[PDB]
Design an enzyme around this catalytic site. Sequence first.
Site, PDB file in Angstrom:
ATOM      1  N   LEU A  64       9.290  -3.185  -2.149  1.00 32.20           N
ATOM      2  CA  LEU A  64       8.873  -4.522  -2.515  1.00 32.20           C
ATOM      3  C   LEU A  64       9.307  -4.877  -3.955  1.00 32.20           C
ATOM      4  O   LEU A  64       9.138  -4.046  -4.847  1.00 32.20           O
ATOM      5  CB  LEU A  64       7.358  -4.477  -2.459  1.00 32.20           C
ATOM      6  CG  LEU A  64       6.552  -5.382  -1.589  1.00 32.20           C
ATOM      7  CD1 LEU A  64       5.780  -6.369  -2.475  1.00 32.20           C
ATOM      8  CD2 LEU A  64       7.419  -6.036  -0.526  1.00 32.20           C
ATOM      9  N   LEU A 113       8.322   0.680   0.710  1.00 31.78           N
ATOM     10  CA  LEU A 113       8.610   0.213   2.044  1.00 31.78           C
ATOM     11  C   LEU A 113      10.030   0.585   2.480  1.00 31.78           C
ATOM     12  O   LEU A 113      10.273   0.763   3.666  1.00 31.78           O
ATOM     13  CB  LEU A 113       8.466  -1.305   2.068  1.00 31.78           C
ATOM     14  CG  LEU A 113       8.341  -2.038   3.407  1.00 31.78           C
ATOM     15  CD1 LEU A 113       7.285  -1.416   4.429  1.00 31.78           C
ATOM     16  CD2 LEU A 113       8.044  -3.556   3.047  1.00 31.78           C
ATOM     17  N   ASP A 144       2.049   1.150   3.353  1.00 27.70           N
ATOM     18  CA  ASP A 144       2.574   0.175   4.329  1.00 27.70           C
ATOM     19  C   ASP A 144       3.628   0.780   5.282  1.00 27.70           C
ATOM     20  O   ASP A 144       3.918   1.979   5.209  1.00 27.70           O
ATOM     21  CB  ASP A 144       3.133  -1.028   3.586  1.00 27.70           C
ATOM     22  CG  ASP A 144       4.127  -0.632   2.484  1.00 27.70           C
ATOM     23  OD1 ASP A 144       4.940   0.304   2.706  1.00 27.70           O
ATOM     24  OD2 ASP A 144       4.131  -1.288   1.404  1.00 27.70           O
TER      25      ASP A 144
END
Lengths: 258, 250, 258
Positions: A64, A113, A144
């Site tokens: 991210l 991620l 995540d």
Amino acid sequence: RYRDIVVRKQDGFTHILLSTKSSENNSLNPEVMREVQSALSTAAADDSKLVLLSAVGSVFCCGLDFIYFIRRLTDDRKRESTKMAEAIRNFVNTFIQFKKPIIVAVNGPAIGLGASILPLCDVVWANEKAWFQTPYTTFGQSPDGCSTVMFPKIMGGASANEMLLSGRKLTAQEACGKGLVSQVFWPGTFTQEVMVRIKELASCNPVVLEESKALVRCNMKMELEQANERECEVLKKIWGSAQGMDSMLKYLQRKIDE
Amino acid sequence: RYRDIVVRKQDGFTHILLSTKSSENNSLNPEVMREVQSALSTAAADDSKLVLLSAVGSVFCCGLDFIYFIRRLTDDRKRESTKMAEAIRNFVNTFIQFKKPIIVAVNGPAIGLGASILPLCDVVWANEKAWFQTPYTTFGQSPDGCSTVMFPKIMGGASANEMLLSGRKLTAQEACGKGLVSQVFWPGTFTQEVMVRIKELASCNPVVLEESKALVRCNMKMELEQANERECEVLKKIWGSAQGMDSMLK
Amino acid sequence: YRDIVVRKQDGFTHILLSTKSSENNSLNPEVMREVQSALSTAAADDSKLVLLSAVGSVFCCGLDFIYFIRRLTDDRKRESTKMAEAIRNFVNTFIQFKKPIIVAVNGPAIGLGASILPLCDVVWANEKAWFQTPYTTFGQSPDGCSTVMFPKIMGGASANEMLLSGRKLTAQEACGKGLVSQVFWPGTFTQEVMVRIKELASCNPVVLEESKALVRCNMKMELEQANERECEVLKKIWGSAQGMDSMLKYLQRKIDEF
């Protein structure tokens, strides 16, 4: 017209290359995430037998873009935190639902991620320039990309908690030991070792490929969906609070002081 | 005041050190397990962000004190086989339910229940003096600590069955390849390495730590509880009967 | 028995693969029926465990495709159904077996010869052994519950690479990937195995069995369901229009060229 990826369709497969211009260093923002989903949607519907995902430049995927994200959060924290958690959820779900093989060539760091999505792809081939880290606790977030279920599944709890709580960085060889990477090749011949195997795969019956992936993915699909949704609901909680960016800011402070 | 363990609360965490007096080689009898449970209750309630578990001495934990247990067995099988099974079950259950991260530093042998309990903690850091074994079949017992489910999950069936059925001993490096240990450190700097990492975790947001642990642990919690129940029923069956101390050997 | 050697002694049954009616210890329905018969007898008699090994330089090169192709030239539809059921029944014998099966692998284990191994209990390999599931190259989907068991033992990246890409693993690599308990050098291999079998056979048979039952109970229904799914897909593939396009390839290949 894609801005952040390059897509090439040839020799029975689609090649998607991360090459981000709206964010630095192949970092993810909602615009990048949408373009990957669009490219995978097309590959799922055309005669592509499989997708090869790789990256342009020295980073596979930084995860991210938190600087992009903080700027959004300063505008409207409640709205933007929801929007980022949904973007992530939808991005992750695209990998969960994708019916054909996704083969990944990792040639540089895979972070956050960018590493969490790898267990949702089918085969991962790396060279020694690649390393893998999920520095979630440092950035002040829970995990995540379904890593809360997938990392214990591929490396066992002790190793998965070390990655998810401790921000341990793995070399390519160590990531292979810990089930993240299928095989590691020398950097000098990496491209040829990847392409020869992609050619072999693209010469198989694409029905047999699809049936086999369906057989591997079916005991886990529900559980992946449920994990993705739980994780995203937690991220909403964290990113919607006033102190949500504090750990990330301290990290940035250390980086600029170094 | 705890007799068999040392407890230090400081710097955002609780450090529990195994150092048993009622048993040798940090063996576990019901008194030791109660003190561990009670020290975990208080860490779960106070402002501790995580628990570091380690050991004083050259042995991490020898598992069940089988001589303490033999003594009790031949003063009343039925009452004492029931009590020991149920003590194991409550000890194991404390780890299953514990909400904060448990980091373990293993600096010598972890045997039987001392190894089995490891997959129920969060991170396991070891040095080369550590080795690991679950010699259940040799003692004529079935496995405990949820190892009947957790060992296949972390190392695969072939390696798990070799541990559980054959009593194989793993070096620290081998335990790491088989998913039992997070990372192996040089014995010279082991303490330093553990503490630098503990300080980094304790500087994290505690809520993010606990949320992260909850997400990792939630898909398995009912399975772990059910496994703990099954194992402890099979131990009652074995220890309850006359010829179930027959293998316990010298 | 024509294709196996069965020795019962010292508290265990030793089943040795030594086929006459096939190349390289390969499995036709005949061989499968003998293995199943020998197991049925070990299950009911006072054997404490089964040791499974092989005579010769190959453990088991999997499905006997020469025999299958001989049947397929006769009646494709009928013979593909019978083959899928033979496999299903064979794999189910391993799923149901209550006593420990220890396997000593002294040469290549290919295809079903490798896929059955995670259904056994302990696997000891010679440093000479290697492991492959080259299903896709011959237009087959996987068998022996490997669609579930491979992801469970080595994680999805390594498992997909085995099942889709036909990767060969050395004994050491297969040990790192959860297929093999331990590797012994060729010189010491026979003695290493036998000292351990002798140790195991001196244990309480009831303890061995209860332990296995505790280990196998969370998975038995999932294995059954996996076996049935895989056998259904095999029927559908072999009954298809392109289903035989890659099988004859086999005739032209030595076992290290799959």
